[PDB]
Every structure is written in structure tokens, then in C-alpha cells.
Amino acid sequence: VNSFSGYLKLTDNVYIKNADIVEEAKKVKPTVVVNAANVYLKHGGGVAGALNKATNNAMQVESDDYIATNGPLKVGGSCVLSGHNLAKHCLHVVGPNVNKGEDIQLLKSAYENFNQHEVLLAPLLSAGIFGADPIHSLRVCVDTVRTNVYLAVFDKNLYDKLVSSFLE
Ligand SMILES: CC(C)[C@H](Nc1ncnc2[nH]c(-c3cnn(C)c3C#N)cc12)c1ccc2c(n1)NC(=O)CO2
């Protein structure tokens, strides 16, 4: 029922909280949870592994059937599939992996997919092992997304750095 609580309001449409996106999905039952996906939808590690494990592998079985018939996504692209027990829908979004040389300009394209949904629970795109500068990813979110986005960042030091840098 989109009952988000305990988020800091950064802008009129962007909110942020130090929390695990899986625990937020369980508490909130959002209409849309965003997965930090890769092009073949292999939900190993990071956000994707955590969401998939919380569905008892249902998300991986559904995603393998999608890829068999439709093929891989593009960097900056997205795919709406079932949200299983975590949300009504899961929006799988592929941000660029700059640790693998993918272009950081495609992070704006990745965030643009959020504009199709009125309200979303999401992670910080291209952060962690994808290698983008997290402060930059937050600025791209704030500049690109017009709909209501609730960012869950599961790392207190990173959350504090993002908040302090934005509040300058
Ligand atoms: C910057 C990070 C703090 C952030 N991670 C997270 N952000 C929010 N909720 C989270 N839950 C978990 C969790 C829950 N259980 N487990 C075992 C995990 C893991 N791993 C992790 C997580 C993050 C955002 C975007 C990402 C990635 N990581 N990593 C990637 O490979 C791709 O893109």
C-alpha cells in the first residue's frame, strides 16, 4: 500500500533511507520494486541476489523464461515482470557497470525508466561493484526522475556520505 516511513526527503520527489531494499519491500508492499539487474537477468549477488532469495527463487525462474523467448536487455533499459511476494511488480533496470568499462552517460537512460511509474522503491543504480560514483548516481536520479522514488541504501557510511554531500 506504498506506506513508506523513516525516509529523509531530499527533494519534492526523491527520498532516501539507510535500509535493505528487501526489508523495505516486506514492510511496505510497494506497487513497484526496482531490481539493479544485468542484461541476461542473472540474479546473483548484490540487490538482485537478495530480492531473488526473498522470492525463494521464483524471480530467477520467471526471468529465465523471459530471456529464453525475448533475449537480453540493453544497458540503460528495463523490463516489468512480477513482483512475486515483495511487490505488485518488479521493474528490472540495467545501469552501466563502469568497473567493466560501460559508459556512465547511460545512467541517465537507466533512471528515465522510473518515469513510467508513479511511485517506486529502488536501489542506487550503478553503485557497489558496478563502480559508479554514488554521489553522481544520486545527482542523476534527482535530475532525471520526476515520479516519487524511495531509495534504500543498505550501507550506513554510504548513506551518510550521500546525505552530507547533497546537503552542501
Ligand atoms: C551500494 C550498495 C549498498 C547497494 N546495495 C544494496 N542496496 C539496497 N538494499 C540492499 N540489500 C542488499 C542485500 C541484502 N542481503 N544481501 C545478502 C544483500 C547483498 N549483497 C544489498 C543492497 C547496491 C546498489 C546497486 C547495486 C549494487 N549494490 N550492487 C550491484 O552489484 C548492482 O547495483
Q: Render 55-105 in DSSP notation, one character per residue.
A: TTTHHHHHHHHHHHHH----TT-EEEEE-TTT-SEEEEEE---GGGT--TT
Cβ partners under 8 Å of residue 59, min gap 6: 35, 43, 51, 52, 81, 82, 84, 90
Q: Rounded to the nearest whole angstrom, what is the distance from the C-alpha of residue 127 to the centroid of ligand 1?
A: 8
Which residue, judged by its Cα, is nearest atom 28 of ligand 1?
A: 128
Q: Rounded to the nearest whole angstrom, what is the distance from the C-alpha of residue 64 to the centroid of ligand 1?
A: 21
Q: How was this structure determined?
A: X-ray
Resolution in A: 1.4
Q: Is the dihedral of CA 86, 163, 148, 96 positive or negative?
A: negative
Q: Rounded to the nearest whole angstrom, what is the distance from the C-alpha of residue 156 to the centroid of ligand 1?
A: 12
Q: Rounded to the nearest whole angstrom, what is the distance from the C-alpha of residue 1 to the centroid of ligand 1?
A: 23
Determine the atom of ligand 1 nearest the C-alpha atom of 125.
Answer: 25
Domain count, the chain: 1
Domain that holds residue 144: 2-166
Ligand 1: which of 21, 47, 130 to mutate, most ligand atoms within 8 Å of CB?
47
H or E segment and range at residue 148: strand 148-153
Please, which residues bridge with residue 32 across strands? 89
Place of cell 506504498: 2
CATH of the domain at 126: 3.40.220.10
Separation of first and last alpha carbons in the chain: 34
**Distance, CA of 44 to CA of 38 (rounded, Å):** 10
CB atoms within 10 A of CB 150: 24
Q: Which triple of cell numbers denotes residue 145?
A: 526522475
